[PDB]
Amino acid sequence: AHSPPGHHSVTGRPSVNGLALAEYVIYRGEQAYPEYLITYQIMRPE
Amino acid sequence: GTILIDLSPDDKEFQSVEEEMQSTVREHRDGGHAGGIFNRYNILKIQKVCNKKLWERYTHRRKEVSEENHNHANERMLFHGSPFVNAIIHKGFDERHAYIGGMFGAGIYFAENSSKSNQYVYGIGGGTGCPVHKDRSCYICHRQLLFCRVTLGKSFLQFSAM
Ligand SMILES: O=c1[nH]c(N2CCC3(CC2)CN(CCO)c2cc(F)cc(F)c23)nc2c1CCCC2
Ligand SMILES: [Zn+2]
User: Fold this and answer.
1) Cβ contacts of B48 on chain A, cutoff 8 Å
2) Pick the CATH number of A1-46 from 3.40.50.2000, 2.80.10.50, 6.20.320.10, 3.90.226.10
3) Helix/strand/coil percent split, chain B, to 5
4) Residue of the CA atom closest to atom 25 of ligand 1
5) Which of B56, B66, B105, B155 could crosslink B73 through cysteines, CB 3.0-4.6 Å?
6) Could you tell me the CATH number of the domain that includes residue B37?
Protein backbone atom coordinates (compact mmCIF):
# COMPACT_ATOMS: atom_id res chain seq x y z
CA ALA A 1 0.00 0.00 0.00
CA HIS A 2 0.88 3.70 0.14
CA SER A 3 1.02 6.15 3.01
CA PRO A 4 -1.69 8.81 3.21
CA PRO A 5 -1.03 11.72 0.83
CA GLY A 6 1.56 14.06 2.28
CA HIS A 7 2.55 11.57 4.99
CA HIS A 8 5.38 9.08 5.45
CA SER A 9 3.77 6.73 8.00
CA VAL A 10 0.70 6.06 10.11
CA THR A 11 0.49 6.24 13.91
CA GLY A 12 -2.21 3.91 15.19
CA ARG A 13 -3.03 5.15 18.66
CA PRO A 14 -5.36 3.10 20.88
CA SER A 15 -8.08 5.35 22.25
CA VAL A 16 -9.88 2.89 24.58
CA ASN A 17 -7.20 0.93 26.44
CA GLY A 18 -5.38 3.82 28.11
CA LEU A 19 -2.36 1.58 28.83
CA ALA A 20 -1.90 0.33 25.28
CA LEU A 21 0.91 2.17 23.49
CA ALA A 22 0.96 3.08 19.82
CA GLU A 23 1.58 0.99 16.74
CA TYR A 24 3.18 2.43 13.62
CA VAL A 25 3.02 1.57 9.92
CA ILE A 26 5.50 2.42 7.18
CA TYR A 27 5.11 1.62 3.50
CA ARG A 28 8.77 1.49 2.39
CA GLY A 29 11.25 -1.08 3.67
CA GLU A 30 13.97 1.57 3.54
CA GLN A 31 12.31 3.44 6.43
CA ALA A 32 13.30 0.82 9.02
CA TYR A 33 16.59 -0.77 10.06
CA PRO A 34 16.65 -3.94 12.20
CA GLU A 35 19.18 -2.71 14.74
CA TYR A 36 19.01 -5.22 17.61
CA LEU A 37 18.14 -8.91 17.58
CA ILE A 38 16.87 -9.94 21.02
CA THR A 39 16.62 -13.62 22.00
CA TYR A 40 14.47 -14.30 25.04
CA GLN A 41 11.94 -16.46 26.84
CA ILE A 42 8.72 -15.27 28.39
CA MET A 43 8.71 -16.01 32.13
CA ARG A 44 5.98 -17.82 34.01
CA PRO A 45 4.41 -15.42 36.55
CA GLU A 46 5.30 -16.43 40.10
CA GLY B 1 26.39 -9.03 4.28
CA THR B 2 24.93 -9.04 7.79
CA ILE B 3 27.12 -9.52 10.88
CA LEU B 4 25.69 -10.05 14.38
CA ILE B 5 27.72 -8.66 17.30
CA ASP B 6 26.93 -10.10 20.75
CA LEU B 7 26.55 -7.51 23.49
CA SER B 8 27.83 -8.29 26.97
CA PRO B 9 25.21 -8.20 29.76
CA ASP B 10 27.69 -5.97 31.61
CA ASP B 11 27.49 -3.43 28.76
CA LYS B 12 25.25 -0.43 29.35
CA GLU B 13 23.95 -0.83 25.79
CA PHE B 14 22.69 -4.35 26.56
CA GLN B 15 21.07 -3.16 29.79
CA SER B 16 19.46 -0.21 28.00
CA VAL B 17 17.85 -2.47 25.38
CA GLU B 18 16.71 -5.01 27.99
CA GLU B 19 15.11 -2.13 29.90
CA GLU B 20 13.11 -1.12 26.81
CA MET B 21 11.95 -4.73 26.42
CA GLN B 22 10.95 -5.19 30.07
CA SER B 23 9.36 -1.80 30.72
CA THR B 24 7.01 -1.99 27.72
CA VAL B 25 5.33 -5.27 28.66
CA ARG B 26 1.61 -4.75 29.16
CA GLU B 27 -1.46 -6.88 29.72
CA HIS B 28 -3.26 -7.81 26.52
CA ARG B 29 -7.03 -7.98 26.14
CA ASP B 30 -6.78 -11.57 24.82
CA GLY B 31 -5.69 -12.77 28.27
CA GLY B 32 -2.45 -14.02 26.76
CA HIS B 33 -4.02 -16.13 24.00
CA ALA B 34 -1.66 -14.94 21.26
CA GLY B 35 1.62 -14.15 23.03
CA GLY B 36 1.37 -16.14 26.26
CA ILE B 37 0.91 -15.29 29.94
CA PHE B 38 3.79 -13.32 31.42
CA ASN B 39 4.83 -10.09 33.12
CA ARG B 40 8.52 -10.12 32.16
CA TYR B 41 11.12 -11.77 29.94
CA ASN B 42 14.26 -13.76 30.50
CA ILE B 43 16.69 -12.07 28.08
CA LEU B 44 19.16 -14.61 26.70
CA LYS B 45 21.11 -12.65 24.09
CA ILE B 46 21.15 -9.20 22.49
CA GLN B 47 23.00 -8.83 19.19
CA LYS B 48 23.75 -5.68 17.22
CA VAL B 49 22.81 -6.16 13.54
CA CYS B 50 25.47 -4.68 11.23
CA ASN B 51 24.96 -4.46 7.47
CA LYS B 52 26.56 -1.58 5.58
CA LYS B 53 24.33 -1.77 2.49
CA LEU B 54 21.12 -1.92 4.53
CA TRP B 55 22.25 0.90 6.82
CA GLU B 56 23.12 3.07 3.80
CA ARG B 57 19.71 2.34 2.26
CA TYR B 58 18.09 3.35 5.55
CA THR B 59 20.04 6.57 6.10
CA HIS B 60 19.56 7.61 2.47
CA ARG B 61 15.77 7.32 2.87
CA ARG B 62 15.94 8.96 6.30
CA LYS B 63 17.55 12.03 4.73
CA GLU B 64 14.86 12.20 2.03
CA VAL B 65 12.08 11.96 4.61
CA SER B 66 13.76 14.55 6.85
CA GLU B 67 13.88 17.09 4.01
CA GLU B 68 10.16 16.50 3.34
CA ASN B 69 9.10 17.08 6.98
CA HIS B 70 10.50 20.43 8.22
CA ASN B 71 13.94 18.79 8.68
CA HIS B 72 12.57 16.18 11.11
CA ALA B 73 13.06 12.47 10.39
CA ASN B 74 10.86 11.62 13.39
CA GLU B 75 13.02 8.57 14.05
CA ARG B 76 11.86 6.11 16.73
CA MET B 77 13.07 2.81 18.18
CA LEU B 78 10.24 0.28 17.97
CA PHE B 79 9.72 -3.47 18.25
CA HIS B 80 8.98 -5.91 15.44
CA GLY B 81 8.07 -9.57 15.88
CA SER B 82 7.89 -11.99 12.97
CA PRO B 83 8.42 -15.66 12.14
CA PHE B 84 10.78 -14.43 9.39
CA VAL B 85 13.17 -12.40 11.56
CA ASN B 86 16.11 -14.29 10.02
CA ALA B 87 15.17 -13.09 6.53
CA ILE B 88 14.69 -9.54 7.80
CA ILE B 89 18.15 -9.23 9.36
CA HIS B 90 19.80 -10.51 6.18
CA LYS B 91 17.61 -8.93 3.47
CA GLY B 92 16.05 -5.95 5.23
CA PHE B 93 12.43 -4.96 5.54
CA ASP B 94 10.48 -5.33 2.30
CA GLU B 95 7.19 -3.58 1.61
CA ARG B 96 6.40 -6.23 -1.02
CA HIS B 97 5.58 -8.35 2.05
CA ALA B 98 3.36 -5.98 3.97
CA TYR B 99 0.91 -7.21 6.61
CA ILE B 100 -2.29 -7.30 4.54
CA GLY B 101 -4.64 -7.78 7.48
CA GLY B 102 -3.42 -4.90 9.61
CA MET B 103 -5.92 -2.35 10.90
CA PHE B 104 -4.01 0.61 9.43
CA GLY B 105 -3.43 -0.63 5.88
CA ALA B 106 -1.09 -3.01 4.06
CA GLY B 107 2.28 -1.97 5.40
CA ILE B 108 5.15 -2.83 7.74
CA TYR B 109 4.03 -2.72 11.40
CA PHE B 110 5.96 -1.83 14.58
CA ALA B 111 5.00 -1.52 18.26
CA GLU B 112 5.96 0.55 21.27
CA ASN B 113 4.90 -2.38 23.51
CA SER B 114 7.41 -5.22 23.26
CA SER B 115 4.61 -7.56 24.30
CA LYS B 116 2.52 -6.53 21.29
CA SER B 117 5.31 -7.59 18.93
CA ASN B 118 5.70 -10.78 20.98
CA GLN B 119 2.21 -11.75 19.76
CA TYR B 120 3.68 -12.20 16.25
CA VAL B 121 6.91 -14.12 16.84
CA TYR B 122 5.22 -17.48 16.15
CA GLY B 123 2.81 -16.14 13.52
CA ILE B 124 -0.35 -14.08 13.25
CA GLY B 125 -2.18 -14.29 16.56
CA GLY B 126 0.67 -16.49 17.78
CA GLY B 127 0.12 -19.00 14.98
CA THR B 128 0.03 -22.46 16.53
CA GLY B 129 2.66 -21.45 19.11
CA CYS B 130 6.23 -22.63 19.42
CA PRO B 131 7.26 -25.21 16.78
CA VAL B 132 8.37 -27.78 19.37
CA HIS B 133 5.38 -27.84 21.76
CA LYS B 134 2.66 -26.00 19.77
CA ASP B 135 2.26 -23.74 22.80
CA ARG B 136 1.64 -20.02 22.33
CA SER B 137 2.58 -19.57 26.00
CA CYS B 138 5.69 -21.77 25.93
CA TYR B 139 8.16 -20.86 28.68
CA ILE B 140 10.93 -23.14 27.34
CA CYS B 141 11.42 -22.29 23.67
CA HIS B 142 13.45 -19.28 22.61
CA ARG B 143 11.76 -16.29 20.97
CA GLN B 144 13.31 -13.44 18.99
CA LEU B 145 12.25 -9.81 18.57
CA LEU B 146 13.82 -6.98 16.61
CA PHE B 147 14.34 -3.54 18.16
CA CYS B 148 14.37 -1.34 15.07
CA ARG B 149 15.23 2.18 14.01
CA VAL B 150 12.13 3.54 12.24
CA THR B 151 11.76 6.78 10.29
CA LEU B 152 8.19 8.04 10.68
CA GLY B 153 8.48 11.47 9.04
CA LYS B 154 5.11 13.20 8.87
CA SER B 155 2.92 10.58 10.54
CA PHE B 156 -0.82 10.37 9.97
CA LEU B 157 -2.50 10.09 13.38
CA GLN B 158 -5.21 7.41 13.34
CA PHE B 159 -7.01 6.84 16.61
CA SER B 160 -8.12 3.25 17.04
CA ALA B 161 -10.92 1.73 19.06
CA MET B 162 -8.45 -0.61 20.83
O1 LIG C 1 5.68 -6.65 15.54
C2 LIG C 1 4.67 -6.72 14.85
N3 LIG C 1 4.73 -7.62 13.72
C4 LIG C 1 3.64 -7.75 12.88
N5 LIG C 1 3.68 -8.62 11.83
C6 LIG C 1 4.91 -9.34 11.47
C7 LIG C 1 4.79 -10.69 10.80
C8 LIG C 1 3.65 -10.90 9.83
C9 LIG C 1 2.40 -10.26 10.39
C10 LIG C 1 2.56 -8.81 10.88
C11 LIG C 1 3.94 -10.17 8.49
N12 LIG C 1 3.60 -11.14 7.41
C13 LIG C 1 3.74 -10.72 5.99
C14 LIG C 1 5.14 -11.01 5.38
O15 LIG C 1 5.96 -11.53 6.40
C16 LIG C 1 3.40 -12.39 8.00
C17 LIG C 1 3.21 -13.65 7.41
C18 LIG C 1 3.04 -14.79 8.22
F19 LIG C 1 2.86 -15.97 7.68
C20 LIG C 1 3.06 -14.69 9.62
C21 LIG C 1 3.26 -13.41 10.20
F22 LIG C 1 3.28 -13.34 11.49
C23 LIG C 1 3.43 -12.28 9.40
N24 LIG C 1 2.52 -7.08 13.10
C25 LIG C 1 2.42 -6.22 14.17
C26 LIG C 1 3.42 -6.00 15.06
C27 LIG C 1 3.34 -5.05 16.20
C28 LIG C 1 2.27 -3.99 15.94
C29 LIG C 1 0.97 -4.69 15.65
C30 LIG C 1 1.07 -5.51 14.35
ZN1 LIG D 1 8.01 -24.72 23.15
Assistant:
1) 35-36
2) 6.20.320.10
3) 30, 25, 45
4) B109
5) B66
6) 3.90.228.10
Which among B62, B1, B85 is positioned nearest to A32, based on CA atoms?
A: B62
Asked how this structure was determined, the answer is: X-ray
- Partner B contacted by A5 (CB < 8 A): no
Chain B 48-107, CB below 8 Å of chain A: which residues? Answer: 48-49, 54-55, 57-58, 60-62, 65, 68-69, 74, 76-78, 80, 85, 88-89, 92-96, 98, 102-107
- Say how far apart CA B60 and CA B110 lie, in whole Å: 21
Resolution (A): 1.8
